[PDB]
Design a protein around this nucleic acid. Structure first.
Ligand SMILES: [Mg+2]
Lengths: 51, 724
RNA sequence: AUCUAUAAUAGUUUUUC
RNA sequence: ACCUCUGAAUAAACUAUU
RNA sequence: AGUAGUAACAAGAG
């Protein structure tokens, strides 16, 4: 969380080079879910070992 | 500048940097699914190498058997199993003539071994193919099941405890019209009654599987597990072959390590000295192609027959049984195959026992060809495999054959200006050829190759080369005017072995010391290896230093122990203490190394015999790499996968076995130290010991007459219970 | 000067088209 | 569907340690 | 999809 906070410049993610055999919107949703759950664990005032 | 590590060999000779050519830091290749494809490939290839042999049908099992002995002499350089029996007998004869008395003395030693060996020799090993369950079992478990089945069928000659009596019981079982077994299912017991041919097929069957974690091989290969019936005969044949090999200078077995390197170096230097200065010398770094798929059990029977001439009949019979059983052997096909339906999204396991009469549309082209080739051989769920030695068996007898071919290379036998000699280890060999000129070298190599062809040995041309004597490779040892160090071979041994904390610490330090002694591991690299091992040990066992804040589940307890300790250096690394090891004290156990630095109470707790983690006394539980047992000598959990199977009564049975064994040890204190021997039952032996001990105690006055009478009454009660 | 204890555990070595 | 269980042992020789 | 490679995993069993 601290390393993420050290970076300013987070834009809206978008696909640049897609996975030709995969479902790229699933990858986008995965990244956005990671960001959302990082914010969730940041807002729970007790960071656990695992999420 | 593009980095090219291989260019290092332009200045460093390849043997001196041979460790760089072993990529043993990554995971080794594994086999993922079934081994049936590899087993069928091996069976087809073995029969193809002997395809010009004579076909017969076995009268006892019905299996088609291919006999390549005395087949046509080859006209090309393809592998073949057409060994000539007279050539093998002549090679044995000349080996005996060059070393007079070798076979006689070897037979004397082997007769002693055969007469003295006990039945529990069969438990030495990991797995044995249990015919009563059609799968692998632990060697002791397989032996116990076989003995129980034999007892239920009136085959009780093994009660003597001798291995040869167990072999007599196996032979008698071969003649039983019906063998009965017991089966479990979802957990009741059911009796199954095999017939003569079914039992005979089971007893001649070797299990097959794939070899996992093999280095240096692109493709996987099949391996074998011998059954319970053949293990004793193979042990006796290998004992004879070992006795012969111990008397042969060219043998690479059964010497290993520094002794093997010294023997090979001495033999090579003796060959160099015996060579005239006015003649060329060349060495062949040679491999053999499919040694075990071209050698025939009939030729091993011939070798054993020649070796055991002028011996008692019983010895010849007991040695001959193993090649006879191996020439009638069957091979388990394995797990089978898995079939996947893409449209219906389903998968299913196809047993190997259905491949006899399964539709061939499912399989792909190569597997269909395998099945079409092997279907005539399939019987009772196994494949008839008469030719060939299956996998990793009779290695020392193979060494004997190779050494005889090497011995054929003396000038008295070549009868020309060239001669040869070399080293032999199972199938691998090195050959030294001497001749006045290059034509003689070529002629000697050709003669060696053709003689090997005659005895059914095919020299791998694509894996062999020849150069001036002085450098060669033999059994993964690289010789450059002497054997060089190869550190990469021992590199996987470094790390946490996974026994327990104390044992793993001892293993790490001992491995570092041994590699310093043997594999030219320098002192600086030894210190760095010690540091890396300590780091891996602390991470693996969650035993980082007490004065650190590595957040683990064990960190709070180690912090508490660190706080209350006065002398921190006395704590073991398992307890969060510091590492006191260096080069000078690698040979010293950790508990003894820092014994005088420990707190009195911490030392008393650590070395407390009344602790639950290890079963004026000392901590005792099989203490390999554990000089002093502490609370860190605990035992990890067993695998619990058996609880979901029908074999889960084995757990209760082994619990009761351990109970009875511990009770017996209460009567015979030396039983754990040295294995007890006897034909009497456990209760009978214990009662007799109790009676003699009570009588002696009464005589010496250690106990009074009332206690003696009480012990006698309890013994009489036990005797009464024994019959009923 | 000779010199394979026994046993247990782990590790190492041992490839056709 | 809940529930319950489970996380997977070739051969030989050798080497190391006990 | 991916791992992977001559056969598998992508949970299995009750
Ligand atoms: Mg070789």
């Amino acid at each position: 969380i601290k390393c993420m906070k050290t970076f300013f410049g987070w834009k809206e993610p978008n696909i640049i080079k897609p996975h030709e055999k995969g479902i790229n919107p699933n990858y986008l949703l995965t990244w956005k879910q990671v960001l959302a759950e990082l914010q969730d664990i940041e807002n729970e005032e007790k960071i656990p070992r695992t999420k | 500048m593009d980095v090219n590590p291989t260019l290092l060999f332009l200045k460093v000779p390849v043997q001196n940097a041979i460790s760089t050519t072993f990529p043993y830091t990554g995971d080794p290749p594994y086999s993922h699914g079934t081994g049936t494809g590899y087993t069928m490939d091996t069976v087809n290839r073995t029969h193809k190498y002997s395809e010009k042999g004579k076909w017969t049908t076995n009268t006892e099992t019905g299996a088609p058997q291919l006999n390549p002995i005395d087949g046509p002499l080859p006209e090309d350089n393809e592998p073949s199993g057409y060994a000539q029996t007279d050539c093998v007998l002549e090679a044995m004869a000349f080996l005996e003539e060059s070393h007079p008395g070798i076979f006689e003395n070897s037979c004397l030693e082997t007769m002693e071994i055969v007469q003295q060996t006990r039945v529990d020799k069969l438990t030495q090993g990991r797995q044995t193919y249990d015919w009563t369950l059609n799968r692998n079992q632990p060697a002791a478990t397989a032996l116990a099941n076989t003995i129980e089945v034999f007892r239920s069928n009136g085959l009780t000659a093994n009660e003597s405890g001798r291995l040869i009596d167990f072999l007599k019981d196996v032979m008698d079982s071969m003649d039983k019209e019906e063998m009965e077994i017991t089966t479990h299912f979802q957990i009741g017991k059911k009796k199954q009654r095999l017939n003569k041919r079914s039992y005979l097929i089971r007893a001649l069957t070797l299990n097959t599987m794939t070899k996992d974690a093999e280095r240096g091989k692109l493709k996987r290969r099949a391996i074998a597990t011998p059954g319970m019936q053949i293990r004793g005969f193979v042990y006796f044949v290998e004992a004879l072959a070992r006795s012969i090999c111990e008397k042969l200078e060219q043998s690479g077995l059964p010497v290993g390590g520094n002794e093997k390197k010294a023997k090979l170096a001495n033999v090579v230097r003796k060959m160099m000295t015996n060579s005239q200065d006015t003649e060329l010398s060349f060495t062949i770094t040679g491999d053999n192609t499919k040694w075990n798929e071209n050698q025939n059990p009939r030729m091993f029977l011939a070798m054993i027959t020649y070796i055991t001439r002028n011996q008692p009949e019983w010895f010849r019979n007991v040695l001959s049984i193993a090649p006879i059983m191996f020439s009638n052997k069957m091979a388990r096909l394995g797990k089978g195959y898995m079939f996947e339906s893409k449209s219906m999204k389903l998968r299913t396991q196809v047993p190997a026992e259905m491949l006899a009469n399964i539709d061939l549309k499912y399989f792909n082209k190569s597997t269909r060809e395998k099945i079409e080739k092997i279907r005539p051989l399939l019987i009772d769920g196994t494949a008839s495999l008469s030719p060939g030695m299956m996998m990793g068996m009779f290695n020392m007898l193979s060494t004997v054959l190779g050494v005889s071919i090497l011995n054929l290379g003396q000038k008295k036998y070549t009868k020309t200006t060239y001669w040869w000699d070399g080293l032999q280890s199972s199938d691998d060999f090195a050959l030294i050829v001497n001749a006045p000129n290059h034509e003689g070298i070529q002629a000697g190599v050709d003669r060696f190759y053709r003689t090997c062809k005659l005895v059914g040995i095919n020299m791998s041309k694509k894996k062999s080369y020849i150069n001036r004597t002085g450098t060669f490779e033999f059994t993964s040892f690289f010789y450059r005017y002497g054997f060089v160090a190869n550190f990469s071979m021992e590199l996987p041994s470094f790390g946490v072995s996974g026994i327990n904390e104390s044992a793993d610490m001892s293993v790490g330090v001992t491995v570092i010391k041994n590699n310093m002694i043997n594999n030219d591991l320098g002192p600086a690299t030894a210190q760095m290896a010690l540091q890396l091992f300590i780091k891996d040990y602390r991470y693996t066992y969650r035993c980082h230093r007490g004065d650190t804040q590595i957040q683990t589940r064990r960190a709070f307890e180690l912090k508490k122990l660190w706080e209350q300790t006065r002398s921190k250096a006395g704590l073991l690394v398992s307890d969060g203490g510091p590492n006191l090891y260096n080069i000078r004290n690698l040979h010293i156990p950790e508990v003894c190394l820092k014994w005088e630095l420990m707190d009195e109470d911490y030392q008393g707790r650590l070395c407390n015999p009344m602790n639950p983690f290890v079963s004026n006394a000392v901590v005792m539980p099989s203490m390999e790499y554990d000089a002093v047992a502490t609370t860190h000598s605990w035992i990890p959990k067993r695998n619990r996968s058996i609880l979901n199977t029908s074999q889960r009564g084995i757990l209760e049975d082994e619990q009761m076995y351990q109970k009875c064994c511990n009770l017996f040890e209460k009567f015979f204190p030396s039983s754990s130290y040295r294995r007890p021997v006897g034909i009497s039952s456990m209760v009978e032996a214990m009662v007799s010991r109790a009676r003699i001990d009570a009588r002696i105690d009464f005589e010496s006055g250690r106990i009074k007459k009332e206690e003696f009478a009480e012990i006698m009454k309890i013994c009489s009660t036990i005797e009464e219970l024994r019959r009923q």
